[PDB]
Amino acid sequence: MDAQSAAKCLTAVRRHSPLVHSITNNVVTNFTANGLLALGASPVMAYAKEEVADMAKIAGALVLNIGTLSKESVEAMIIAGKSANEHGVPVILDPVGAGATPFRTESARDIIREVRLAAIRGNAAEIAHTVGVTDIIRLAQQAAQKLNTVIAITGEVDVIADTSHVYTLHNGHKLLTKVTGAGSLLTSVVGAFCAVEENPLFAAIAAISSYGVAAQLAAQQTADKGPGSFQIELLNKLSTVTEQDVQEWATIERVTVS
Amino acid sequence: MRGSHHHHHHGSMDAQSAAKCLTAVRRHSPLVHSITNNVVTNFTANGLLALGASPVMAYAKEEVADMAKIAGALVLNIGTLSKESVEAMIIAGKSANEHGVPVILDPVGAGATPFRTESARDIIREVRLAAIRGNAAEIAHTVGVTDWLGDIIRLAQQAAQKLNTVIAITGEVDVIADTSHVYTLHNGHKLLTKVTGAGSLLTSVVGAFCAVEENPLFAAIAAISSYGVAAQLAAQQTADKGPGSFQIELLNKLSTVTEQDVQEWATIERVTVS
Amino acid sequence: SMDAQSAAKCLTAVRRHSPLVHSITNNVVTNFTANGLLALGASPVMAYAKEEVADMAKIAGALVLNIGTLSKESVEAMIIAGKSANEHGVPVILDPVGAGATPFRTESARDIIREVRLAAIRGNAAEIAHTVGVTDIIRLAQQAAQKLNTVIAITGEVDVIADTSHVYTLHNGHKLLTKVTGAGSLLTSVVGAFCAVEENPLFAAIAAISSYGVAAQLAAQQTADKGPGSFQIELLNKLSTVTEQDVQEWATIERVTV
Ligand SMILES: Nc1ncnc2c1ncn2[C@@H]1O[C@H](COP(=O)(O)OP(=O)(O)OP(=O)(O)O)[C@@H](O)[C@H]1O
Ligand SMILES: Nc1ncnc2c1ncn2[C@@H]1O[C@H](COP(=O)(O)OP(=O)(O)OP(=O)(O)O)[C@@H](O)[C@H]1O
Ligand SMILES: Nc1ncnc2c1ncn2[C@@H]1O[C@H](COP(=O)(O)OP(=O)(O)OP(=O)(O)O)[C@@H](O)[C@H]1O
Ligand SMILES: Cc1ncsc1CCOP(=O)(O)O
Ligand SMILES: Cc1ncsc1CCOP(=O)(O)O
Ligand SMILES: Cc1ncsc1CCOP(=O)(O)O
Ligand SMILES: [Mg+2]
Ligand SMILES: [Mg+2]
Ligand SMILES: [Mg+2]
Ligand SMILES: [Mg+2]
Ligand SMILES: [Mg+2]
Numbered sequence: 205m206d207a208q209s210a211a212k213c214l215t216a217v218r219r220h221s222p223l224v225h226s227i228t229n230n231v232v233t234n235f236t237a238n239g240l241l242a243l244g245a246s247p248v249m250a251y252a253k254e255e256v257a258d259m260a261k262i263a264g265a266l267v268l269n270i271g272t273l274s275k276e277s278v279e280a281m282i283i284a285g286k287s288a289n290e291h292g293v294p295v296i297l298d299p300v301g302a303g304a305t306p307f308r309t310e311s312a313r314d315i316i317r318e319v320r321l322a323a324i325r326g327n328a329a330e331i332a333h334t335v336g337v338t339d340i341i342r343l344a345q346q347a348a349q350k351l352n353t354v355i356a357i358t359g360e361v362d363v364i365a366d367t368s369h370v371y372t373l374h375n376g377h378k379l380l381t382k383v384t385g386a387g388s389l390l391t392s393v394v395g396a397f398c399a400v401e402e403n404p405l406f407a408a409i410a411a412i413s414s415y416g417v418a419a420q421l422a423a424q425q426t427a428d429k430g431p432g433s434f435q436i437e438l439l440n441k442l443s444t445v446t447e448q449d450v451q452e453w454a455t456i457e458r459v460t461v462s
Numbered sequence: 463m464r465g466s467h468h469h470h471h472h473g474s475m476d477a478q479s480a481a482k483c484l485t486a487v488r489r490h491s492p493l494v495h496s497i498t499n500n501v502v503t504n505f506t507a508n509g510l511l512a513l514g515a516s517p518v519m520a521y522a523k524e525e526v527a528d529m530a531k532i533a534g535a536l537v538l539n540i541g542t543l544s545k546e547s548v549e550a551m552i553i554a555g556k557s558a559n560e561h562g563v564p565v566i567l568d569p570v571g572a573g574a575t576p577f578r579t580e581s582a583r584d585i586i587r588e589v590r591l592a593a594i595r596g597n598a599a600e601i602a603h604t605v606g607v608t609d610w611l612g613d614i615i616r617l618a619q620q621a622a623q624k625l626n627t628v629i630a631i632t633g634e635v636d637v638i639a640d641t642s643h644v645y646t647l648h649n650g651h652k653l654l655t656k657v658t659g660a661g662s663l664l665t666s667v668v669g670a671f672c673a674v675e676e677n678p679l680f681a682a683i684a685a686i687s688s689y690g691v692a693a694q695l696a697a698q699q700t701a702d703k704g705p706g707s708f709q710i711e712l713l714n715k716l717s718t719v720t721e722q723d724v725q726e727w728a729t730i731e732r733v734t735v736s
Numbered sequence: 737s738m739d740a741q742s743a744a745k746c747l748t749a750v751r752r753h754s755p756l757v758h759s760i761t762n763n764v765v766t767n768f769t770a771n772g773l774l775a776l777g778a779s780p781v782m783a784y785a786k787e788e789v790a791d792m793a794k795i796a797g798a799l800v801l802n803i804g805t806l807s808k809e810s811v812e813a814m815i816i817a818g819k820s821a822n823e824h825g826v827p828v829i830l831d832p833v834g835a836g837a838t839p840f841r842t843e844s845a846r847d848i849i850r851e852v853r854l855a856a857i858r859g860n861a862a863e864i865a866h867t868v869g870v871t872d873i874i875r876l877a878q879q880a881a882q883k884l885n886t887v888i889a890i891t892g893e894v895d896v897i898a899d900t901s902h903v904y905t906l907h908n909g910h911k912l913l914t915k916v917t918g919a920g921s922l923l924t925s926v927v928g929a930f931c932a933v934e935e936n937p938l939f940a941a942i943a944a945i946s947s948y949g950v951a952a953q954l955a956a957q958q959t960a961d962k963g964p965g966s967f968q969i970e971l972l973n974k975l976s977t978v979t980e981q982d983v984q985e986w987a988t989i990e991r992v993t994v
């Protein structure tokens with residue numbers, strides 16, 4: 205899996221314009237929909253228990269985010285997840301805040317036990333707190349082997365590992381940490397890619413790589429204006445990034461282990 | 463504040479009359495109360511403020527009735543609807559109708575799921591609507607059909623005739639109609655398809671105009687045209703930059719577009735019918 | 737007692753400690769608030785569920801309650817979280833958005849005051865007056881701070897801030913903030929940010945509002961005649977860009993004799 209494969213997956217997301225159903229936090233709804241529209245995908249947000257199962261089945265991908273979770277909303281995520289698995293719709297989870305409060309940790313787990321997930325995307329602390337029922341390259345694998353899915357731990361360096369493989373990504377910019385939704389949007393981007401790419405691990409890597417190179421390009425363009433401009437430039441790049449920009453910038457390293 | 467800026471007795475709703483309505487909106491700065499989806503809250507409010515109106519969001523049943531009666535226009539949006547929201551939307555719709563406040567509906571997603579479809583229909587049965595804005599499919603599921611897939615008149619006008627309201631089906635070409643009149647607008651830019659809320663914001667702008675224009679057909683036409691021109695103006699400064707810059711520019715133009723810009727750029731076409 | 741040089745000193749403190757500001761606010765300003773705080777140098781977090789508000793607040797640096805789009809459930813949650821804050825010495829800030837415009841907002845605002853010890857209350861003259869009751873702006877702020885034994889920050893053209901025995905007048909910011917939704921909500925949260933590192937609440941409010949106002953000014957010059965949209969973005973950049981220096985320079989703080 206390299207730069208060439210990634211770039212090609214980006215073109216397929218644009219060619220099919222995957223409908224991504226997100227049940228996420230109200231701090232990133234607008235950013236997320238705008239990011240997906242820019243990428244070339246079709247976003248849709250639905251949270252009511254009277255329709256999440258109906259919306260998930262006609263979708264290309266379902267993404268769950270607990271950022272500002274509620275009891276009834278968590279209830280809806282699982283309902284939607286079950287409807288999704290029943291129809292072959294890839295499900296991606298973003299364990300926002302897992303470990304911060306007991307409720308988020310419980311909820312993350314709850315969803316993982318009730319929904320066949322295609323991938324989980326979060327920071328190291330969140331993956332660890334979620335998976336740490338008792339007593340990050342090695343963290344990814346163990347988590348991916350245990351939960352049996354694609355574990356994507358993003359940060360200065362991205363660590364994506366699946367049942368038997370491990371990859372590290374080297375793109376993006378530190379400015380991404382100053383924009384709320386950077387992760388929520390990314391997680392949703394991952395869903396858009398899993399919708400057109402049969403291999404989850406490959407979808408994650410491509411989605412994250414495309415996202416990163418887009419962020420670098422926005423970064424240089426943003427010069428030193430600030431967080432506001434960068435945010436705006438990211439939405440622009442997700443649209444202007446080309447299959448080529450990915451090919452010559454994407455840094456994908458297949459980790460050799462045991 | 464709701465007067466009339468054009469009458470068919472003077473001819474077809476035109477470009478100058480629409481320019482008139484824009485100044486009127488900015489003169490009175492109507493308080494536009496919208497019970498909308500949480501994907502477009504911030505953008506809606508910023509767009510309305512840029513235009514010159516007064517945005518306000520209130521969803522609680524404990525207050526919607528009160529907020530609606532002192533509003534210039536009420537706008538209902540089911541983008542991320544819930545049972546509570548719909549009940550609220552109807553509570554407020556009724557109170558708005560009871561106080562003569564024009565109510566605008568944006569059937570976001572009608573058709574995608576039967577829940578959105580039923581809710582949109584529940585609102586229409588319970589609330590008198592001044593206008594309804596949405597795309598071709600949403601409009602079709604809201605009013606009736608079966609075999610989805612002649613909108614530039616037929617659908618728009620027949621929809622208006624059944625629900626006795628104003629039907630505005632936006633798109634590359636816009637079809638606005640009431641029980642016996644229909645128009646087509648040719649303003650805007652393709653980049654509005656890349657901004658979330660572009661339509662929810664527009665339905666809101668429709669509310670503001672309805673608050674200053676007695677005739678909803680006219681208010682709707684003036685609203686969409688001013689919105690489209692601003693869009694056009696916005697795309698020019700930022701077409702090579704991307705959706706992000708466009709989004710921001712659109713907000714900039716909604717405040718700097720003048721009635722001059724609207725009178726000279728607006729392209730409104732009266733459709734011969736019946 | 738408090739001046740520009742000290743104000744700027746606080747801005748540095750915020751960025752140094754990057755306090756966790758817990759906001760239970762309206763869904764019209766959530767994305768703007770988190771981005772604004774991030775650019776400033778604070779760490780925002782939003783949590784509304786009663787199954788976690790007490791837990792999130794006790795681990796925060798400051799709690800802010802904004803009733804912009806209030807519901808019965810969120811108001812009860814704001815109180816539950818308020819009390820938890822009180823018990824852990826976490827400053828609480830209240831933004832009575834719309835108080836006086838609707839009876840429910842008025843009562844929800846008063847109910848919160850009755851149950852939660854607050855460090856400050858930020859809002860426009862009308863909201864403060866309808867909330868606290870009737871006894872210019874300087875007299876109003878002073879009487880209010882005295883009755884509720886808290887800090888009253890009535891922003892606007894000229895900012896009037898006062899605790900039970902002191903009153904200050906601020907003269908920064910720019911008119912365009914009037915055209916950006918959430919300008920007040922982000923400010924309140926900014927206030928919470930300053931309260932998280934400045935022991936005296938009155939000094940905190942002043943420092944927060946001055947910094948915010950200077951940033952607003954700078955963004956407006958760079959914005960000029962472009963529009964509300966470009967301003968909103970520039971404001972985000974400036975909350976990141978503005979320096980201790982800029983505050984010491986532009987900050988215009990004035991103590992009133994009464
Ligand atoms: N310091 C950094 N330098 C370069 N790229 C980064 C950095 N931090 C994150 N990224 C990248 O930013 C994107 C943002 O995802 P990120 O892991 O920050 O989200 P998150 O869910 O908000 O987490 P966190 O709470 O830790 O901010 C990814 O493409 C990631 O590789
Ligand atoms: N292809 C286009 N070319 C020019 N203007 C357009 C185009 N599509 C929409 N507009 C304009 O954009 C505005 C946006 O309304 P639109 O019909 O896209 O909203 P919507 O509710 O988001 O629908 P949709 O889901 O189909 O994106 C109107 O002013 C309309 O005339
Ligand atoms: N006319 C003005 N000129 C300059 N600065 C202003 C003006 N009005 C407000 N500000 C500043 O704007 C910031 C915004 O707070 P503001 O009082 O407008 O918020 P609000 O909660 O939205 O209230 P309101 O509903 O009355 O608009 C503060 O820094 C304040 O000093
Ligand atoms: C600030 C904040 N508080 C609760 S969710 C949230 C946003 C989630 O953001 P991100 O995708 O960056 O993790
Ligand atoms: C992405 C999304 N999901 C539910 S509502 C919504 C926004 C509605 O947007 P628009 O006004 O463009 O039709
Ligand atoms: C338009 C609107 N409607 C309900 S809350 C809200 C935003 C409140 O904003 P601000 O902090 O500027 O007062
Ligand atoms: Mg982050
Ligand atoms: Mg995250
Ligand atoms: Mg659209
Ligand atoms: Mg729409
Ligand atoms: Mg306010």
Ligand SMILES: [Mg+2]
Nearest residue numbers: 913914919920
């Ligand atoms: Mg304001």
